[PDB]
């Protein structure tokens, strides 16, 4: 038998590291059917912000138009979600891109010649030769132009390379960024890499104490296999640092003395946000969308 | 997105194919998990081509010659009545704009005849829509002034990599794409990466392409430490197996000696039976 | 040709680390592997983006038909 209180007095979570971008928190005593659901939503069904529609005016550079629009779409923006709702696709463009949903950024650059003593880099030989990410000037319009004063829309990676120009070339574009789920397109995935592994339960079966243990600590990572002295035990220090590689399996001496197992309830989460949010808020919103997904089916009538 | 092969012959650098990159590298795992691919087929991650995986374009040049000897067909318009709504592509000079979207049945060049006093539009009928990138003007040289009568226009077609394209490697395993699966329904490794490409492991007992296995060891062993291992066949022997030499590098890098990385299924979310084979290939 | 941003497999930004990679290989006499480690490339899915890029776009811009020579 299983109930909500039987799981509440059983489910805990630990933390291995706490960073502004990375995160490693270990879910303890939870089922795979829920772990993969959290991992699924954090990548497929979490809203983000990315450039959807791009309007160009003149591009005489070598890199063509659709590729430039694709690149300026790929570059992320350090803008916080929940400050702008979803657009309606069936509406026309003029009634689709309002101020509550659409954020407009512009890019204007005109390279020119700079006299200098000549192998010469384009920074000295030319002016405005390279186009970086910080050149994307965010422009606020509509009814709210002060709600982004303390939160200026800026690409989360200001050093992203966009294109290399030469004198005579000019680029002038006005692009719009919109929301989206990770399942719709790759640019709308605010998480770099989110997955989960299992705790390798290294169960020792025989008294491997001795010089054999000296050849055990070298195979596994250093912070895994430990001993009090040369004898009287051969234990494991930390079962999270190890790697499931079965390298001890290809040894005639260590073939059957130990088995690499698995824990059906010990999971770890490694989430690296793309800058739009924190690796913790991305988890609160992911489980919130899952709870709201259950709310939509709970409060809904049946048909036929 | 053409990239240099990590496992390249010593002669690949002699001619300098780095100037003209043919293909690129991609993480490939010999798995049957998908099922849609069988005995020839191949899959591509949805997020892979969503970011420019194997992107490519075409370039179709057209040569238009006017006036099928007083010349009567001149590029441009005249003076009498003519319908509007086709000025988005053509200019007042009789040439199309550089960059407009031109699908099948669009004006490329309009000509004004004097024998009929009408501006007829030479249509454009082809397979796929194209973007104009450059328009050349050509006029025969002579002691007397001669108006231009030959225009050379060059197109470009955004060929997004879809399924059914004969994707392959440098070992002779020609295949096609069955369906592009999403990343969340794609098996993920212990690190968290999802192999964007999965080739059928059942074609190896028949195709007998062991090269995509040993080179897959050298590919991952080269990407981990940065150093590139030259292929240059007929340098090893049975005493020194390349799977052993490429295996020891993975053993001291963290991976196993067999080059098999344990992964998890994306759909159900469980650990697979045994260690599965991964790696990058050109 | 151009530096691929948002590596296909992982999804991490790659475009910013190209100029820094060349700087580590020019001013510090630093090798290949340690460069990608200090530059912030852990997973081999994304290491093979900077480690393998060709950067042909510089060779493209050597022919400018909009200016003499």
């Amino acid at each position: 038998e299983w109930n909500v209180e039987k799981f509440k007095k059983d489910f805990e979570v630990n933390i291995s590291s706490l960073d502004a971008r990375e995160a490693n928190f270990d879910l303890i005593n939870i089922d795979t059917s829920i772990a993969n659901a959290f991992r699924r939503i954090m990548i497929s069904e979490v809203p983000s912000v990315a450039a959807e529609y791009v309007y160009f005016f003149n591009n005489t550079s070598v890199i063509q138009d659709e590729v430039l629009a694709h690149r300026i779409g790929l570059v992320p923006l350090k803008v916080d979600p929940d400050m702008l709702t979803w657009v309606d696709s069936n509406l026309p463009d003029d009634e689709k891109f309002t101020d509550e949903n659409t954020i407009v950024l512009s890019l204007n650059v005109k390279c020119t010649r700079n006299p200098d003593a000549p192998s010469t880099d384009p920074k000295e030989l030319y002016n405005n030769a390279h186009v970086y990410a910080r050149d994307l000037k965010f422009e606020p319009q509509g009814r709210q132009s002060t709600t982004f004063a303390d939160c200026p829309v800026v690409p989360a990676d200001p050093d992203i390379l966009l294109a290399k120009l030469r004198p005579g070339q000019e680029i002038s574009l006005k692009a719009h960024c919109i929301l989206g789920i990770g399942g719709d397109h790759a640019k709308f995935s605010p998480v770099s890499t989110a997955s989960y592994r299992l705790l390798p339960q290294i169960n020792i079966l025989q008294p491997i104490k001795g010089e054999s243990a000296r050849r055990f600590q070298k195979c596994f990572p250093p912070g895994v296999i430990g001993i009090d002295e040369g004898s009287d035990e051969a234990y494991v220090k930390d079962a999270r640092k190890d790697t499931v590689s079965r390298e001890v399996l290809r040894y005639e001496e260590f073939a059957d003395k130990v088995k690499l197992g698995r824990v059906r309830n010990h999971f770890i989460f490694n989430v690296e946000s793309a800058g739009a949010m924190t690796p913790e808020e991305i988890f609160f919103k992911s489980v919130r969308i899952l709870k709201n997904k259950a709310e939509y089916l709970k409060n809904c009538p049946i048909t036929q | 997105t053409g990239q240099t092969p990590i496992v390249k012959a010593n002669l690949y650098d002699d001619y300098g194919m780095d100037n003209f990159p043919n293909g690129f590298n991609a993480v490939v795992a010999v798995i049957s998990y998908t099922g849609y691919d069988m005995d020839d087929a191949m899959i591509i991650n949805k997020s892979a081509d969503e970011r420019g995986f194997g992107y490519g374009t075409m370039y179709k040049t057209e040569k238009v010659d006017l006036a099928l000897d007083p010349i009567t067909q001149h590029f441009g318009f005249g003076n009498d009545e003519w319908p509007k709504e086709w000025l988005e592509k053509l200019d007042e000079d009789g040439l199309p704009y550089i960059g407009t979207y031109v699908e099948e049945g669009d004006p490329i060049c309009a000509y004004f005849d004097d024998t009929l006093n009408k501006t007829k539009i030479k249509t454009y009928h082809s397979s796929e829509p194209a973007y104009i990138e450059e328009v050349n003007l050509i006029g025969d040289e002579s002691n007397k002034f001669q108006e231009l009568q030959t225009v050379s226009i060059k197109y470009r077609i955004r060929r997004t990599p879809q399924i059914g394209d004969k994707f392959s490697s440098r070992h002779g395993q020609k295949g096609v794409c069955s369906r592009k699966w999403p990343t969340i329904d794609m098996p993920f490794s212990e690190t968290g990466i999802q192999p964007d490409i999965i080739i059928n492991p059942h074609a190896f007992p028949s195709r007998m392409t062991i090269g995509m296995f040993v080179e897959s060891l050298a590919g991952k062993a080269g990407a981990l430490h940065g150093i590139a291992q030259d292929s240059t066949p007929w340098i090893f022997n049975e005493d020194d197996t390349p799977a052993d030499y490429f295996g020891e590098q993975l053993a001291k890098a963290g991976y196993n000696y067999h080059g098999n990385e344990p992964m998890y299924s994306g759909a159900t979310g469980e650990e697979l039976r045994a260690d599965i084979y991964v790696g990058v290939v050109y | 040709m151009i530096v691929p941003v948002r590596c296909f497999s992982c999804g991490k930004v790659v475009g910013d680390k190209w100029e820094s990679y060349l700087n580590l290989l020019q001013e510090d006499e630093l090798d290949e592997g340690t460069a990608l480690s200090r530059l912030g490339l852990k997973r081999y899915c994304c290491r093979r983006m900077i480690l393998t890029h060709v950067d042909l776009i510089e060779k493209f811009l050597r022919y400018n038909p909009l200016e003499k020579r």
Partner: peptide, 21 residues
């Protein structure tokens, strides 16, 4: 015959991605 030139100065960068050292 020369068997193979082995790499020199190798290290590890691998699992436990929540802390390197």
């Amino acid at each position: 015959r020369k068997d193979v030139p082995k790499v020199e100065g190798l290290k590890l960068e691998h699992f436990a991605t929540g802390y390197d050292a």
